[PDB]
Design a protein around this ligand. Sequence first.
Ligand SMILES: Cc1cc2nc3c(=O)[nH]c(=O)nc-3n(C[C@H](O)[C@H](O)[C@H](O)COP(=O)(O)O)c2cc1C
Ligand code: SF4
Ligand code: FES
Lengths: 87, 431, 213
Amino acid sequence: SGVNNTKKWKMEFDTRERWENPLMGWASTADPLSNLVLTFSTKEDAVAFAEKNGWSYDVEERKVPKPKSKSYGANFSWNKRTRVSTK
Amino acid sequence: KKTSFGSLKDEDRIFTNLYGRHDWRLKGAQSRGDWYKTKEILLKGPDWILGEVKTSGLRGRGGAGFPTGLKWSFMNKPSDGRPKYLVVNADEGEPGTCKDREIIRHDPHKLVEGCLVGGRAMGARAAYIYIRGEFYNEASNLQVAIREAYEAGLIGKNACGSGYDFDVFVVRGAGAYICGEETALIESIEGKQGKPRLKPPFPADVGVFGCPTTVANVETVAVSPTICRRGGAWFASFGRERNSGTKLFNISGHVNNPCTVEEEMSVPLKELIEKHAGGVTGGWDNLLAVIPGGSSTPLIPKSVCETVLMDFDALIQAQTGLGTAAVIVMDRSTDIVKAIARLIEFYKHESCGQCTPCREGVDWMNKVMARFVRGDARPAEIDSLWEISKQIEGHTICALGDGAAWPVQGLIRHFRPELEERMQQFAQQHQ
Amino acid sequence: ALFVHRDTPENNPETPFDFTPENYKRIEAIVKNYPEGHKAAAVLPVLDLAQRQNGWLPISAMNKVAEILQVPPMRVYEVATFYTMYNRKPVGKYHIQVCTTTPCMLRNSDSILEAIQKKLGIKVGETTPDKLFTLIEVECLGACVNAPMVQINDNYYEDLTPKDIEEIIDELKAGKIPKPGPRSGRFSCEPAGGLTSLTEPPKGPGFGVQAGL
Ligand SMILES: Cc1cc2nc3c(=O)[nH]c(=O)nc-3n(C[C@H](O)[C@H](O)[C@H](O)COP(=O)(O)O)c2cc1C
Ligand code: SF4
Ligand code: FES
């Protein structure tokens, strides 16, 4: 339930091939950016960084949970379906 | 103003068939003044009835002692389409408390009339009397009385010819002390596990079936008709200020004549025990400790019992409470640690399990107390147990958690040398 | 003492249970005590009626209550396992319940419990081989001034001594039904040796009635 990992903007790159090392079976890669993940305060900072470095990018708008209406009393409604059968 | 209280005269007792030596049925009840001028009281109106209860200074007799007049006035509001209910708490589950049992079986008509009069003040359409399942014969006695009231036209359609309709249902419990807690009682009536609700909402807004409800103890309801007939000023003439009225007391444990008795509020604890219960077993000098208001109240040692009064404010100043006014007396032959340890075992068996501090904390306290009984512990654990009790107190949904912590705090407060002595003995015997 | 159910040949969903025609009439009265739309409030009284008819609650009795009241069976299971007066296993003909909470303990409920075990030859929680008696300890039964006491089925037996309870058990074996109430000399909760109150004849209608009514 913690939300502390959803505060900042990230920049990652497209995933590329990983294959099995013949000797050990370890995951090998030829992608030097496979682990590169950058952090930004705002999407404008992230876009600016991407533009000056020549990378083409996709921007996904931040999803924020919408305000919910909560009422403990609704659990015991006289004539509404919200009444709970167990506690 | 009076300096001293007690010596209540029979003419001033409310529960005049307390011992069942007179007919408990309707004819006996009417001959004793019940159902007299109930129509006139009803036609006075809810505001007049609520005024009389406010003036009487009556406070809840179920253990918490809320001012009854103010509490019942939460219902005195316009209807919004939902019905309104009075719920009478006849669960009587607190160890040491058996007062409500005698009202139900020997003075059932006082309770039935109280429902009508009390329900009228709240504008309730019906009263649900919740009685613990073990009280089967008492429930049947009450059911017989209710049928008599119905047959005589005293309740039901056009109750007492007053033009007010009112029903009185009896619903039995199935074995749970937590169902005496006011919101868990409501949940039980609704067919669920007796698990208390959080507040808000409060019952006067959202209660049984989700409707405006008032939960009232049997004794609180049963004295309301008399208060209206004789007036609040008569009732307020008993006891100290803000501690008004008469009170039913249960005196059990190490006394010569364990009994139930009605007595003035603010009577000294010592006078109550010696005058009515026949004194402490082995003499007053044999007294060790008293639990003054049922198992949920901290015990007080003999030195405090010398002068303390039995009312809400006096017992609070003595670091305990009036509770249900169930006086449990322990003489010096008692193993005080075992007696308290058994009470924590009771709370462990009665915890509904809903909320963390009582589901886990009370069971934890139970385990430590069992070791403390045998002395199989270190003195540093006493302060730890005190802190655990304070982590339960005030952090739970309902007051059962508070009720399990307080007896432990009473034992540690007044009998810490005894606990340490038990540990020191164990260490030597097991060295 | 467990709170999960395992089907056995004698307790399974196909164990026969149904309410008798009279008990179905009583159920209608129970259900009619509650507002329409809230039939679930009848789970406790109806579930207890099933036990009264049957002695205990097989899983099939719990299922039948759920069906009648149109509540999910789990919600009946929750009630059956929450409240201690419901017997989810068969109990002897006489369910002897001894209070051992502190007020009864202070007045020697241990002697009462030990007397019963010695006479019946069983331990707490057990049923006799004849299946006539079951013995358990219970918490406060609301008769503390009349301690020590026991509840056998629906009745209270109060101010017991080891001699009194052994006489009560002998009557139960004989097929008699002992009278409930105190066994010491008094009638209920009055102090022994003489009333300290309510000695005078009570006042009649209208006594002390304020002016204005
Ligand atoms: C664990 C627990 C058990 C209770 N048992 C009872 C009871 O048996 N009878 C009772 O009147 N109040 C009992 N109460 C108190 C009720 O919750 C409530 O305060 C009372 O019924 C209100 O009635 P009153 O204001 O007239 O006293 C209990 C409370 C708790 C926390
Ligand atoms: S304090 Fe105990 S009895 Fe009260 S709601 Fe929490 S778990 Fe249940
Ligand atoms: S302690 Fe046994 S009946 Fe109350």
